């Protein structure tokens, strides 16, 4: 029915601790697999933390809030979603300061938000600048995700795909250096060929096939036209329907259908175009007057894909087909081509410049190989985006966690007041990331973590990390286990933003 | 939820052996079986037992599927498979309790099976002399009709003898399909006889007693009111309009029987009922009309002369008619029957008519006649005869134990148990005759030790002794004993090879 008091403060803790205990052992290169039982008897053995919680239904309101905050975090950056839910479950796991000390959560939130300012200040002190102009330094960053994959045979060519895609989308003139892979870098899959055939072209590709040979095959000066209106029968302002059942109604409708389309098609062929692009659909009779002028028919394109075509050639978006003019020209484009690739037709409006848009063309021997590269390249594109957003790396593999937790201990000696006791609990809760790395390797956890803290005290805090392969401690300056800064900045920010949301809930009530 | 997991595959076949062990022999007991259409039936044939008893265990279904292969290439000894191979799996359980592996019994059974196929030609005493006489044929058939219908073999051994001699000049064509059985209700088995050609129990409904026409057409539709293949809206209002349809029905049927007279066909077979006015039109144009309500009686005629059954109401089709030499009527046993005789042809069709007062009794004679034809259907091959009554079952068990004793190694255990499975068949014959089975086996081995061969069981309730099978006229088929030993050993090695059964979804 309803629940209030201190029970929902402990009820939201065990709801987030249960989600964190599921995917706690799935961290690092030695991530353990998880077995999901379906009602139909199916079993998937995926060890990906985003794939486990997606196929698991939850009923708690706090546990439902735990999944969606990492799902939105997966859409922002393509790496670090498992470390968010682990850190959000460890910060709430020390319930001795929440219930036994009878402390209000406002003291904890004032201690948690004050510890959030020490997260950004410590990571900028252990950071290191990146020479992004050298292509050898960019290869040592993306290689952490290309290992144990089928794309690893072509790592020298697959790295050129993601690096050339992020640089074309990023605009240095705007200052803020925006990269959006979903719009300006729309990836499409083409069957046939091999992995070496996949390259990057500077344009937009249309997956509509060719149904008639009366089209433009090779045009050096493509005259493009964009239109928003439909090419069909004229409908009124009412919501009436079109039903053709009588022979008297079949003649009167088709005579009005032919006379309006021929009046529409006369306005576009007077400019002598090469390819027509309409927003809505194109009827079968509309192609009959269009094939006499040998124009390539392209239909069913979204409004978001329409502006990428207008920025590729420089055309004008015209609302109505009766209002065409001479300014709707595509002068400056490279070549128009309808050449088949593996018995599929594709339209090319590519150019020899950077018209603020691009696409990725994938090829492969089978359709399962097409799905393998697109899930590896999109994971690789978001990691290399964070490097070009800010050229700064952090020592990963638990080295940044012990460097941050060492700075919080010396800061807590000068932090007076009641809030110093939950302030020291965040330093021990940030140690769970190198704790599960030793437990997944199989060595003694407390024997290695105690010597890990002794190396972070006397020696330099930027070195002496954990290697998740052999099970011992190595120096992070020797191996390429470097993490991006913007990934680790949003990881500690979201883990605090989750802990500020679940601890502030003090009542769960119903109502529609 | 698991006790032995190898014993339950054998116990399901031991229940299949018990339903025919007490039903073995001329002194075997009958079985009150219930048909699936809720009909009471009394029989003792081993093939009719498995047809009605829907056995469900798939481990015992291998011996039933071996019985369907036992019915092929030989028509003798279906009860021999369910007794001997049942004794194989029962005696194999005494070896597995000691510690012997199941793969050791398998190779030991196939060794003694090939050894038993060499001793069986040594026991062939007599053979058929190919004289085509009724004295030579009925002397060997008296043993096969025994264990089916005991006491009435003196009338059955002479009737099937007169049928198979008429086919034996047709060399290489003798089969069980040439001798058909048609049951007629009557007094008893003493009034039964044998006729040539195709004989049906129903007489000619027409008034023609003899016709020499060759064209025979069969129509499965009854003689009734004609319905057009189109819609045909026929409406009547007054009594004069009803008489125009009544007289018009007889006038159209007058042209329907005239189309049979136009093609030169004077023999018509009707599956359904015949109207009285249509029966008058058949006798006007001298057409023989025979009513056959049975579908198996109609399907028999299509496979002999080629006359097919057409669903239309008398269509004049010259292509789908049959050909016969002489169709006439004969009065045999106070009942007129129709004979499809072959006068111009040499003839290879014979029909044994059986008489009786009970349909449950006459069906057991039909299984005894078809097993009598199948005894000589085997003897179209190489003629070799073996002594019956358990005479060959002791001598084969005497030589295999003598062979398995001299052979050293671990394989001597499965060879010794292959001989004792042959001892259950005289144990089945002694138990069903009310005699102590332990005394007859000792009396059989004492006379076979001195070399007195061809000694089997004396069929008598008061006499527990034995007698000679050569002087008694008891003789079995060597090919009937050849395929029975081979198929039962191949069936009993299949059950021992399968260890566990797992159900699977399609």
């Amino acid at each position: 029915k309803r629940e209030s008091g201190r029970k929902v403060q402990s009820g939201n803790i065990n709801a987030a601790k249960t989600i964190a205990d599921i995917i706690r052992t799935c961290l690092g290169p030695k991530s353990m697999m998880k077995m999901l039982l379906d009602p139909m008897g199916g079993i998937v053995m995926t060890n990906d933390g985003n794939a486990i919680l997606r196929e698991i239904q939850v009923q708690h309101p706090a546990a439902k809030s735990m999944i969606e905050i990492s799902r939105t975090q997966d859409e922002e950056v393509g790496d670090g979603t498992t470390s968010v839910i682990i850190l959000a479950g460890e910060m709430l796991s020390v319930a001795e300061h929440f219930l036994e000390q009878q402390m209000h959560p406002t003291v904890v939130i004032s201690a948690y938000r004050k510890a959030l300012d020490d997260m950004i200040s410590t990571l900028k002190k252990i950071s290191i600048p990146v020479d992004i102009s050298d292509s050898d330094m960019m290869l040592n960053i993306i290689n952490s995700s290309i290992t144990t994959k089928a794309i690893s045979r072509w790592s020298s060519l697959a790295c050129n795909i993601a690096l050339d895609a992020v640089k074309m989308v990023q605009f240095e003139e705007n200052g803020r250096k925006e990269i959006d892979i979903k719009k300006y870098a729309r990836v499409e899959k083409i069957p046939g060929g091999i992995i070496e055939d996949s390259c990057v072209l500077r344009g937009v590709m249309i997956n509509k096939d060719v149904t008639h040979p009366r089209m433009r095959r090779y045009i050096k000066n493509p005259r493009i036209v964009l239109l928003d209106s439909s090419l069909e029968y004229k409908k009124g302002e009412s919501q009436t329907d079109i039903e053709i059942t009588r022979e008297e109604d079949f003649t009167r409708i088709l005579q009005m259908e032919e006379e309006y389309i021929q009046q529409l098609c006369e306005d576009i062929i007077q400019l002598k175009p090469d390819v027509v692009i309409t927003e809505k659909g194109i009827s079968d009779l509309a192609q009959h007057y269009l094939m006499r002028a040998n124009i390539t028919a392209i239909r069913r394109v979204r409004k978001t894909d329409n502006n990428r075509i207008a920025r590729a050639c420089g055309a004008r978006i015209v609302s109505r087909p009766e209002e065409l003019r001479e300014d709707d020209v595509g002068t400056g484009a490279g070549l128009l081509e309808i050449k088949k690739i593996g018995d599929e037709y594709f339209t090319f409006i590519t150019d020899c410049k950077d018209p603020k848009a691009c696409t990725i063309l994938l090829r492969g021997a089978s359709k399962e190989i097409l799905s393998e590269v697109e899930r590896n390249l999109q994971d690789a594109m978001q990691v290399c985006r964070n490097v070009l957003l800010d050229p700064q790396l952090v020592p990963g593999g638990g080295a940044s966690e012990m460097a941050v937790a060492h700075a919080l201990t010396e800061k807590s000696k000068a932090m007076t007041g009641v809030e110093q006791w939950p302030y020291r609990a965040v330093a021990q809760a940030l140690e769970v990331i190198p704790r599960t790395l030793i437990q997944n390797c199989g060595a003694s956890t407390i024997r290695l973590l105690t010597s890990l803290r002794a190396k972070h005290t006397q020696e330099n805090c930027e070195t002496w990390g954990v290697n998740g392969e052999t099970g011992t401690l190595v120096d992070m300056k020797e191996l390429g286990i470097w993490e991006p800064l913007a990934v680790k900045l949003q990881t500690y920010k979201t883990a605090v933003e989750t802990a500020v949301l679940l601890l502030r809930i003090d009542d769960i009530v119903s109502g529609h | 939820g698991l006790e032995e997991a190898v014993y339950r595959n054998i116990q399901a076949c031991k229940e299949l052996a018990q339903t025919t062990r007490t039903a073995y022999g001329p002194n075997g007991m009958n079985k009150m079986v219930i048909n699936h259409l809720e009909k009471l039936f009394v029989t003792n044939d081993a093939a009719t037992i498995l047809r009605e008893l829907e056995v469900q265990h798939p481990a015992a279904k291998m011996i039933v599927m071996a019985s369907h292969m036992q019915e092929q290439e030989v028509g003798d000894g279906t009860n021999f498979v369910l007794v001997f191979a049942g004794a194989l799996l029962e005696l194999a359980e005494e070896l597995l309790r000691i510690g012997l592996s199941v793969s050791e019994v398998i190779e030991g059974y196939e060794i003694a099976c090939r050894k038993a196929h060499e001793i069986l030609p040594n026991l062939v005493c007599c053979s058929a002399k190919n004289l085509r006489d009724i004295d030579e044929v009925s002397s060997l058939l008296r043993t096969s009709i025994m264990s089916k219908q005991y006491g009435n073999e003196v009338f059955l051994a002479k009737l099937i003898a007169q049928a198979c001699v008429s086919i034996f000049p047709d060399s290489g064509h003798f089969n069980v399909d040439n001798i058909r059985v048609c049951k007629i209700l009557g007094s008893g088995i003493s009034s039964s006889s044998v006729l040539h050609g195709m004989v049906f129990k129903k007489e000619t409904e027409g008034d023609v007693t003899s016709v020499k026409d060759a064209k025979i057409a069969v129509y499965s539709c009854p003689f009734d009111g004609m319905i057009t293949e189109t819609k045909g809206t026929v409406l009547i209002k007054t009594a004069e309009e009803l008489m125009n349809f009544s007289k018009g029905e007889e006038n159209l049927m007058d042209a329907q029987v005239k189309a049979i007279a136009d093609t030169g066909a004077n023999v018509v077979v009707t599956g359904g009922k015949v109207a009285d006015m249509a029966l008058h039109y058949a006798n006007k144009y001298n057409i023989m009309l025979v009513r056959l309500n049975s579908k198996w009686d109609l399907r028999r005629l299509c496979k002999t002369v080629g006359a097919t059954a057409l669903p239309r109401l008398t269509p004049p089709v010259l292509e789908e008619m049959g050909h016969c030499d002489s169709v006439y009527l004969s009065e045999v046993g106070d009942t007129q029957v129709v004979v499809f005789k072959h006068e111009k042809e040499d003839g290879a069709i014979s029909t044994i008519v059986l008489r009786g007062s009970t349909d449950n009794l006459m069906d057991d004679i039909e299984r005894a006649v078809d097993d009598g034809v199948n005894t000589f259907k085997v003897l179209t091959r190489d003629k070799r005869l073996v002594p019956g009554g358990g005479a060959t079952e002791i001598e084969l068990a005497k030589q295999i134990t003598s062979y398995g004793e001299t052979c050293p190694g671990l394989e001597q255990y499965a060879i010794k148990k292959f001989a004792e499975a042959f001892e259950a068949i005289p144990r089945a014959l002694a138990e069903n005759s009310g005699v102590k089975a332990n005394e007859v086996i000792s009396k059989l081995y004492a006379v076979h030790q001195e070399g007195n061969k061809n000694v089997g069981l004396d069929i008598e309730a008061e006499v527990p002794a034995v007698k000679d099978m050569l002087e008694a006229g008891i003789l079995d088929t060597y090919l009937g004993k050849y395929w029975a030993i081979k198929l039962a050993t191949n069936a009993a090695v299949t059950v021992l090879r399968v260890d566990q059964i797992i159900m699977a979804k399609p």
Binding site: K34 | S101, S103, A504
Partner: protein, 514 residues
């Protein structure tokens, strides 16, 4: 509940449970299993692929191992139930060290170290013998004797050896689609043999037909000579039953003009004596058209298949024809003995002694229904084993000689990743010895008696030792002719390391909701 290591203890019991079931059907001395469909279908097999794919298990963990053997037959075609017996002992021997406090990731790191050393050991024991008739008999004998009750073990070897040897020439790759498998009833199980030509399901049904044609010209046809529709602009109109008799003669006249055209093409091209003519028309043939062709000596066949027509193109050489109006002699072929094989019920046309058919039909005969499906799954496993022997010229000794030799090579081997990977090569050496262990139980001998004798046999030379199925003595696999494939043993060690990893790499099981 139970958020602990209990998710591993339930998965190894499904592995131990699937090991104890499938251990009774390895080798020729093993037993068989029955597959009941619930409706009455009975099937007996020893193949572990059909024992896991067709057989349904209730346990969810054991359903994953059923998906392992489906991936085994796609690359090799052998060793599916031997895949289960290794991974059953691999997770059994892992439990001796996990209960002592060792992490399963450490044993996984030792299993990949034992996989690279055992794969390097397979390159030294392989024998690059020249592929001839005699060495392919021993390869076919190790594969076909495990699906046969030892009465067809001698007859079925020469049927599969001579079939693949007739299609292995000019260094061409072996294609299994060139081999046609046909089944016929009313015969014994030992009556199977090889057929040079093809087997058609329906033959000529006419009393005036020739029973055997020694030489003939085969015309490929695909035209329906039955009652067809109009090819000219007309319609089906009739006023009564007499108008239908005029219409059926005006419609069938489009058929018999083509039938007499085949006789005009027969008399033109080789119309003299010592000739022949067979029609291989796939579609239906008019029964009135069968009387018109059989009077001049033409055997007409009807009711064929689509795949059989393509094999008739390679056998005779005639191009597939679609219309009789443009009949031409380049669509004609040639064959040798064209006769009919008579059964108890049906008849089958046999077209052997072809010029260059490039297709061999295997004729498998059986008395029962389940007997036909057992040999059909045996000939597909036997032909794929010899195909692995021709394409991969190196072979390995059989009778478990590789697994005992790999147990000694893995003992004298130190790990180079850590010290705790010493149990990874220890448990991999003990789990590979389950194949001489399970071959003692199926043969009826003691398990530990022949294991000592197979391990004490060592010498200062190259010598392989295996188990004996008859006496239980040490037996050299090269001296008796027991050989396996190098490709099967390479995929055996590769697939066993992957599947035993994934069962060892789970810690929690959750109920999904799609």
């Amino acid at each position: 509940v139970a958020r602990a290591q209990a998710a591993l203890a339930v998965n190894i019991s499904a592995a131990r449970g699937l090991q104890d079931v499938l251990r009774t059907n390895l080798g020729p001395k093993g037993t068989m299993k029955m597959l009941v469909s619930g409706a009455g279908d009975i099937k007996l097999t020893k193949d572990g692929n059909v024992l896991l794919h067709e057989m349904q298990i209730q346990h969810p963990t054991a359903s994953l191992i059923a998906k392992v053997a489906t991936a085994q037959d796609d690359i090799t075609g052998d060793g599916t139930t031997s895949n289960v017996l290794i991974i059953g002992e691999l997770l059994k021997q892992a439990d001796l060290y996990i209960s002592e406090g060792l992490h399963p990731r450490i044993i996984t790191e030792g299993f990949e170290a034992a996989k690279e050393k055992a794969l390097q050991f397979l390159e030294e024991v392989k024998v690059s013998r020249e592929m001839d008739r005699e060495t392919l008999i021993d390869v076919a004998r190790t594969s076909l004797r495990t699906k046969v009750h030892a009465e067809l073990a001698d007859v079925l070897t020469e049927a599969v050896v001579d079939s693949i040897l007739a299609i292995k020439k000019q260094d061409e790759p072996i294609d299994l689609f060139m081999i046609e498998i046909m089944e016929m009833k009313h015969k014994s199980e030992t009556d199977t043999s090889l057929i040079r030509g093809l087997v058609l399901d329906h033959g000529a049904r006419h009393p005036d037909m020739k029973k055997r044609v020694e030489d003939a010209y085969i015309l490929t046809c695909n035209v329906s000579l039955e009652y067809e529709k109009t090819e000219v602009n007309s319609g089906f109109f009739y006023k009564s039953a007499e108008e239908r008799e005029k219409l059926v003669k005006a419609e069938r006249k489009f058929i018999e003009d083509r039938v007499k055209k085949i006789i005009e093409l027969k008399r033109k091209v080789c119309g003299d004596s010592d000739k022949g003519f067979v029609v291989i028309n796939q579609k239906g043939i008019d029964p009135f058209s069968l009387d018109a062709l059989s009077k001049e000596g033409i055997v007409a066949l009807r009711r064929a298949k689509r795949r059989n027509m393509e094999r008739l193109t390679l056998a005779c050489g005639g191009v597939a024809l679609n219309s009789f109006d443009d009949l031409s002699p380049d669509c004609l072929g040639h064959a040798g003995l064209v006769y009919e094989y008579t059964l108890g019920e049906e008849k089958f046309t046999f077209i052997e002694k072809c010029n260059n058919p490039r297709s061999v039909t295997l004729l498998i005969k059986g008395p029962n229904k389940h007997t036909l499906t057992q040999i059909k799954d045996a000939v597909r496993d036997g032909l794929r084993a010899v195909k692995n022997a021709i394409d991969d010229g190196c072979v390995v000794p059989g009778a478990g000689a590789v697994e005992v030799a790999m147990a000694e090579a893995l003992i004298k081997h130190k790990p180079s990743v850590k010290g705790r990977a010493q149990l990874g090569v220890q448990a991999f050496a003990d789990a590979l010895l389950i194949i001489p262990k399970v071959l003692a139980q199926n043969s009826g001998f003691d398990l530990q008696e022949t294991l000592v004798k197979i391990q004490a046999e060592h010498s200062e030379s190259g010598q392989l030792v295996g188990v004996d199925l008859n006496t239980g003595e040490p037996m050299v696999a090269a001296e008796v002719g027991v050989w396996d494939n190098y490709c099967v043993k390479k995929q055996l060690l590769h697939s066993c390391t992957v599947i035993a990893t994934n069962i060892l790499l789970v810690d929690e099981i959750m109920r999904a909701g799609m």
